[PDB]
Enzyme design. Structure first.
Site, PDB file in Angstrom:
ATOM      1  N   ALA A  84      -0.528  -9.887   3.261  1.00  0.00           N
ATOM      2  CA  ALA A  84       0.363 -10.273   4.062  1.00  0.00           C
ATOM      3  C   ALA A  84       0.012 -10.041   5.452  1.00  0.00           C
ATOM      4  CB  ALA A  84       1.999  -9.875   3.840  1.00  0.00           C
TER       5      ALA A  84
ATOM      6  N   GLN B 265       0.825   4.055  -3.043  1.00  0.00           N
ATOM      7  CA  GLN B 265       0.089   5.169  -3.119  1.00  0.00           C
ATOM      8  C   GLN B 265       1.251   6.476  -3.265  1.00  0.00           C
ATOM      9  OE1 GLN B 265      -3.840   4.069  -0.462  1.00  0.00           O
ATOM     10  NE2 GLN B 265      -2.282   5.058   0.804  1.00  0.00           N
TER      11      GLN B 265
ATOM     12  N   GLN C 108       1.014  -1.118   0.086  1.00  0.00           N
ATOM     13  CA  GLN C 108      -0.191   0.186   0.165  1.00  0.00           C
ATOM     14  C   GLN C 108       0.692   1.139  -0.022  1.00  0.00           C
ATOM     15  OE1 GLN C 108      -2.641   2.299   3.389  1.00  0.00           O
ATOM     16  NE2 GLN C 108      -3.539   0.267   2.576  1.00  0.00           N
TER      17      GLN C 108
ATOM     18  N   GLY D 172       3.273  -6.042   6.031  1.00  0.00           N
ATOM     19  CA  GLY D 172       3.683  -7.432   5.749  1.00  0.00           C
ATOM     20  C   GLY D 172       4.392  -7.523   4.256  1.00  0.00           C
TER      21      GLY D 172
ATOM     22  N   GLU E  49      26.570  10.520  -8.878  1.00  0.00           N
ATOM     23  CA  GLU E  49      27.875  11.263  -8.391  1.00  0.00           C
ATOM     24  C   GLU E  49      27.681  11.663  -7.169  1.00  0.00           C
ATOM     25  OE1 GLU E  49      29.871  13.696 -11.563  1.00  0.00           O
ATOM     26  OE2 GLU E  49      30.006  15.228  -9.995  1.00  0.00           O
TER      27      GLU E  49
HETATM   28  N1  GTP Z   1       3.711   7.620   3.837  1.00  0.00           N
HETATM   29  C1  GTP Z   1       2.967   6.728   3.858  1.00  0.00           C
HETATM   30  N2  GTP Z   1       2.877   5.670   4.740  1.00  0.00           N
HETATM   31  C2  GTP Z   1       1.970   4.708   4.539  1.00  0.00           C
HETATM   32  C3  GTP Z   1       1.146   4.904   3.184  1.00  0.00           C
HETATM   33  N3  GTP Z   1       0.177   3.728   3.468  1.00  0.00           N
HETATM   34  C4  GTP Z   1       0.306   3.007   4.462  1.00  0.00           C
HETATM   35  N4  GTP Z   1       1.677   3.664   5.266  1.00  0.00           N
HETATM   36  C5  GTP Z   1       2.407   2.991   6.307  1.00  0.00           C
HETATM   37  O1  GTP Z   1       2.979   1.885   6.021  1.00  0.00           O
HETATM   38  C6  GTP Z   1       2.835   0.826   7.292  1.00  0.00           C
HETATM   39  C7  GTP Z   1       1.931  -0.315   6.900  1.00  0.00           C
HETATM   40  O2  GTP Z   1       2.116  -1.128   5.864  1.00  0.00           O
HETATM   41  P1  GTP Z   1       1.248  -0.732   4.360  1.00  0.00           P
HETATM   42  O3  GTP Z   1       2.349  -0.706   3.154  1.00  0.00           O
HETATM   43  O4  GTP Z   1       0.009  -0.050   4.470  1.00  0.00           O
HETATM   44  O5  GTP Z   1       1.079  -2.420   4.470  1.00  0.00           O
HETATM   45  P2  GTP Z   1       1.321  -3.552   3.029  1.00  0.00           P
HETATM   46  O6  GTP Z   1       2.948  -3.188   2.414  1.00  0.00           O
HETATM   47  O7  GTP Z   1       0.312  -3.316   1.888  1.00  0.00           O
HETATM   48  O8  GTP Z   1       1.486  -4.786   3.667  1.00  0.00           O
HETATM   49  P3  GTP Z   1       0.245  -5.497   3.959  1.00  0.00           P
HETATM   50  O9  GTP Z   1      -1.083  -4.978   3.945  1.00  0.00           O
HETATM   51  O10 GTP Z   1       0.208  -6.491   5.391  1.00  0.00           O
HETATM   52  O11 GTP Z   1       0.204  -6.824   2.782  1.00  0.00           O
HETATM   53  C8  GTP Z   1       2.307   1.827   8.376  1.00  0.00           C
HETATM   54  O12 GTP Z   1       3.453   2.376   8.980  1.00  0.00           O
HETATM   55  C9  GTP Z   1       1.478   2.879   7.537  1.00  0.00           C
HETATM   56  O13 GTP Z   1       1.464   4.305   8.250  1.00  0.00           O
HETATM   57  C10 GTP Z   1       1.049   6.089   2.693  1.00  0.00           C
HETATM   58  O14 GTP Z   1       0.263   5.918   1.658  1.00  0.00           O
HETATM   59  N5  GTP Z   1       1.979   6.865   2.775  1.00  0.00           N
HETATM   60 MG    MG Z   2      -1.902  -3.789   2.270  1.00  0.00          MG
END
Ligand code: GTP
Ligand code: MG
Ligand code: GDP
Ligand code: LVV
Ligand code: MG
Lengths: 69, 440, 421
Positions: B99, B15, B11, B144, B254
């Site tokens: 995950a 994003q 995610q 995850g 560099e």
């Molecule tokens: N800066 C920022 N942090 C994010 C964003 N989305 C999730 N996070 C952070 O990422 C962490 C959660 O991991 P995610 O990326 O949402 O989870 P995932 O990688 O999809 O892994 P799973 O959902 O368990 O399969 C938390 O610390 C969130 O605050 C985003 O759009 N921007």
């Molecule tokens: Mg996710």
């Protein structure tokens, strides 16, 4: 100096190939160790659930031997 | 030639990828349908922006990117969103079950089902490059997928592409927007696993970005959208040398030579300025001296830590917009006078400067004001290890009781991997101490 | 999508199960005929978690109704939302269970379990990506208590890596006078500690006290007690069925809530029974808990909170931090940031704002000590054991169930007294 130049580039190539090789082997070891562990954990769980069914049968059986028919 | 492939995982990675590519398209004049009227190179070209975009015969400029996530809901928004026509459908890869905030499920149980498809898609992007330079991997520490699947992908990329350079943009966890209690676990595990497979990683502390949004943009409760647009500006600054060219432009690689003195010491601290609302920008024009001074204010750092408590091993200034060397030199002369910037005794103390003349860009509906000049500083300071220390302490608190460890063991992992990863972090903290000790 | 398969067993299980589907159906704009007439697209966003879509844009609850007697399920089929359920998912016997755990688990319950599994297997087979099951039942009777845990074991054999979640109604002398309920409850807890991933402890002792002392109901009925259960079940499932970031599926909730596999018994709460500070203080009050336990007699391992309605998220964040800082003594130090907060803009029916509380507290040992106290009061004199030994059981199974639940209590105490240093 030409033979030293050969040895350097050969060493650079050997270092790339060896990085690939070691990474390939470590990952293969983790992949295999993880497959064994998870499957083993599921086997233990199902084995316990099998002992439950075995027990439920010796309970239904125990009720039979309590008959005065 | 010199192509860079971007890989957005989970995610957070996806994003942030939405924000970055939207900003790229605006900076280059690329429309949501991929058309770029200013590009007279139809179907190809060697322009600087071609490092990040391929071209089709129909005039489409397609990001050299892969989006991957183990559940579909986040990438589904890309598929139906404003830029859905920007990507070929095969660049957006999703599974059905994620995950569950469990590194083990992203690296093993679930990740192993889709890793081959992902590598196949990356290979199709690689085959289109005439001189692939490396990869940029965007991911969270705490998720995850961001932790477990990124690690697996990084390991597999080392196998498939060898010494090819791999850089990370890594989202360090903060409580204000964290989603899992075990995020310290996933952070240590992925940092340990990928440490050997990246030669440069830019950590982005969500708490730092959260505070900057609240303080500098007067946003009560910043959302991921608020955070990601700020993050995209920092990412844009860093990749601008690759996507634009110019007389004063200095290639990111560099800076890399100066930023990484040893393979393991490859975690630069990023500071961006100016971060200012439109209300304030309407009154103030921020000069080169002002934005440079802001780089050394800890409040503008991407990672919470105190560089005064550490030593510098490198300092790079990436300017963009209306900036000439004369103004930079003067601003730098002042800063060295007012701020004690302590370097280790074994490396030079001169700041390395690059200037990209293309002015900063902002996305409509955003909170960042559009300014004429901006700067991203990248420094290699031993103080960034403080971020490891905070993470290691939470790890230790939970691991001493084996709290939540059964979720990982149940998925095939062993306690030895936890202690092995934690020992690597302890060695890393020790390495950062050693590089700062004076020579005798 | 990410489907959940719902099962309700026995009288209590089907009673609260029907109310649950009534309440959430109203939330998702589904009428008794299974048609959608809501107003917000957020209602249908994740509808497939609990509902199938039949022909004609009809939504059928992915629900299975089980009982060893027809009575309770007949009145469900004649209830308000009775016609919404799939007629083929009613699986019932005739002999009944007679409040006997042994009958529901080993004898009559075991003769009907296979036909239940056929329907379970049919629902799961048509899931895009099944995530797990939720079971509603009581622990004091015989069907939901005995056959309910049997279904869990049998289901877990065919879906070992899916999440198993139950809403378990704990018995209380204040509500039911049936004398053997401590036996059935302990035999059930014996199973739940092993075969479920997360269990909401719905305590009839606390429901009664809420109705009587808080709601001023001199003579609480089951309908009154069940209004609290459905309001609670709605709250604790809001994250599963509405677009959300935190604890959005059964597994992620388990990973945030269960630091040790056996300590998966949750203390649910609700508020109100109005400002954000008041909501937050009330949801953490012992009088707002659905389990007859005072969290100030133990410590929190983990907590999940969900706020519903339109409100200032900045204010929620401050109040959630405030309640943690001022009560730090009651949160284990060795699990940092163990309180997670979700928000859903859609409030429950009738209320503009609501807060639902899910606590994994060591104070829940008070609930198990109460059951163990009632249990040993009868077992140390071997009272009423013939109902159960006559079905094939022996005193050994009782002894084992006693020690397992007693072990659970000491494990809760072990982590309550643990320290960081
Ligand atoms: N800066 C920022 N942090 C994010 C964003 N989305 C999730 N996070 C952070 O990422 C962490 C959660 O991991 P995610 O990326 O949402 O989870 P995932 O990688 O999809 O892994 P799973 O959902 O368990 O399969 C938390 O610390 C969130 O605050 C985003 O759009 N921007
Ligand atoms: Mg996710
Ligand atoms: N809260 C609540 N508890 C109930 C309800 N019906 C029965 N109970 C409780 O459940 C226990 C009896 O179990 P029961 O459901 O009749 O067993 P079964 O039908 O044979 O599976 C008693 O302790 C009752 O207090 C109900 O509708 N709501
Ligand atoms: C010849 C050679 C040099 C360096 C490396 C190691 N390096 C790790 C970091 S990386 O994955 O970004 C790029 C490769 C291997 C071979
Ligand atoms: Mg009854």
């Amino acid at each position: 100096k030409r033979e030293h130049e050969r040895e350097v580039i050969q060493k650079a190539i050997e270092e790339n190939n060896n990085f690939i090789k070691m990474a390939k082997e470590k990952l293969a070891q983790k992949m295999e160790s993880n497959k064994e562990n998870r499957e083993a954990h599921l086997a233990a769980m199902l084995e316990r659930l099998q002992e439950k069914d075995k027990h439920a049968e010796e309970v239904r059986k125990n009720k039979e031997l309590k008959e005065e028919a | 030639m010199r192509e860079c492939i971007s890989i957005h995982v989970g995610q957070a990675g996806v994003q942030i990828g939405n924000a970055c590519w939207e900003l790229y398209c605006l900076e280059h004049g690329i429309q949501p349908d991929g058309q770029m009227p200013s590009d007279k190179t139809i179907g190809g070209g060697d322009d600087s922006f071609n490092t990040f975009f391929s071209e089709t015969g129909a005039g489409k400029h397609v990001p050299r990117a892969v989006f991957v996530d183990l559940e579909p809901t986040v990438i589904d928004e890309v598929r139906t969103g404003t830029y859905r026509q920007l990507f070929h459908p095969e660049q957006l890869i999703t599974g059905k079950e994620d995950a569950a905030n469990n590194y083990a499920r992203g690296h093993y149980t679930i990740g192993k089902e889709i890793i081959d498809l992902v590598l196949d898609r990356i290979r199709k992007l690689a085959d289109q490059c005439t001189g692939l330079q490396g990869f940029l991997v965007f991911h969270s520490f705490g998720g995850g997928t961001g932790s477990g699947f990124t690690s697996l992908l990084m390991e597999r990329l080392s196998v498939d592409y060898g010494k090819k350079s791999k850089l990370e943009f890594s989202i360090y966890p903060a409580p204000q927007v964290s989603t899992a209690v075990v995020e310290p676990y996933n952070s240590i595990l992925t940092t340990h696993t990928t440490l050997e497979h990246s030669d440069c990683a830019f950590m982005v502390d969500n708490e730092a970005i959260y505070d900057i949004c609240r303080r500098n943009l007067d946003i009560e409760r910043p959302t991921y959208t608020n955070l990601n647009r700020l993050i995209s500006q920092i990412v844009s600054s860093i990749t601008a040398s690759l996507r634009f060219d110019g007389a004063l432009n200095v290639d990111l690689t560099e800076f890399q030579t100066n930023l990484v003195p040893y393979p393991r010491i490859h975690f630069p601290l990023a500071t961006y300025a100016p971060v200012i609302s439109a209300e304030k920008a309407y009154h103030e024009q921020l000069s080169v001296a002002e934005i440079t001074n802001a780089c050394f204010e800890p409040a503008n750092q991407m990672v919470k830590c105190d560089p005064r408590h550490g030593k510098y091993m490198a300092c790079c200034l990436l300017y963009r917009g209306d900036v000439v060397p004369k103004d930079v030199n003067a601003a730098i002369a002042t800063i060295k006078t007012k701020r004690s910037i302590q370097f280790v005794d074994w490396c030079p103390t001169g700041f390395k400067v690059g200037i990209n003349y293309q002015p900063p860009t902002v996305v409509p509906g955003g909170d960042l004001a559009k300014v004429q000049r901006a700067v991203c500083m990248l420094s290699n300071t031993t103080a960034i290890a403080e971020a490891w220390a905070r993470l290691d302490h939470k790890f230790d608190l939970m691991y001493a009781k084996r709290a939540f460890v059964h979720w990982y063991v149940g998925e095939g992992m062993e306690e030895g991997e936890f202690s092995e990863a934690r020992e690597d972090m302890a060695a890393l903290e020790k390495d950062y101490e050693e590089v700062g000790v004076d020579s005798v | 999508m990410r489907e959940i398969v719902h099962i309700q067993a026995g009288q209590c299980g089907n009673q609260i199960g029907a109310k649950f589907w009534e309440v959430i159906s109203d939330e998702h704009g589904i009428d008794p005929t299974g048609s959608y007439h809501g107003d917000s697209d957020l209602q249908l966003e994740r509808i497939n978690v609990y509902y199938n879509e039949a022909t004609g844009n009809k939504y059928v609850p992915r629900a299975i109704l089980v009982d060893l007697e027809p009575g309770t399920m007949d009145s469900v089929r004649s209830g308000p939302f009775g016609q919404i359920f799939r007629p083929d998912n009613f699986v019932f016997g005739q002999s009944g269970a007679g409040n006997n755990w042994a009958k529901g688990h080993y004898t009559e319950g075991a003769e009907l379990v296979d036909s239940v599994l056929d329907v379970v297997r049919k629902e799961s087979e048509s899931c895009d990506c099944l995530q797990g099951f939720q079971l509603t039942h009581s622990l004091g009777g015989g069907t939901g208590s005995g056959m309910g845990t049997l279904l869990i074991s049998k289901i877990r054999e065919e879906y070992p890596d899916r999440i198993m979640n139950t809403f378990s109604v704990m018995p209380s002398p204040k509500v039911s006078d049936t004398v053997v309920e401590p036996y059935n409850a302990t035999l059930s807890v014996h199973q739940l500690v092993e075969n479920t991933d997360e269990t909401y402890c719905i305590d009839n002792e606390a429901l009664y006290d809420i109705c009587f002392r808080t709601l001023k109901l001199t003579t609480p009925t089951y309908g009154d007690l069940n209004h609290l259960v459905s309001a609670t079940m709605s709250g604790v499932t809001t994250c599963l069925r509405f677009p959300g970031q935190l604890n959005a599926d059964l597994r992620k909730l388990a990973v945030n809530m269960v630091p040790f596999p056996r300590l998966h018994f949750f203390m649910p709460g609700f508020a109100p029974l109005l400002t954000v500070p008041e909501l937050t203080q009330q949801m953490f009050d012992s009088k707002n808990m659905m389990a007859a336990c005072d969290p100030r007699h133990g410590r929190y391992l983990t907590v999940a909170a969900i706020f519903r309605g339109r409100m200032s998220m900045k204010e929620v964040d401050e109040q959630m931090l405030n309640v943690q800082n001022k009560n730090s003594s009651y949160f284990v130090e060795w699990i940092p940031n163990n309180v997670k907060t979700a928000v859903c803009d859609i409030p429950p029916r009738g209320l503009k704002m609501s807060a639902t509380f899910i606590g994994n507290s060591t104070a829940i040992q008070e609930l198990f000590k109460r059951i163990s106290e009632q249990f040993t009061a009868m077992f140390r004199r071997k009272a009423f054991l013939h109902w159960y030994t006559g079905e094939g059981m022996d005193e050994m199974e009782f002894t084992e169930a006693e020690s397992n639940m007693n072990d659970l209590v000491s494990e809760y105490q072990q982590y309550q007294d643990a320290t960081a240093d």
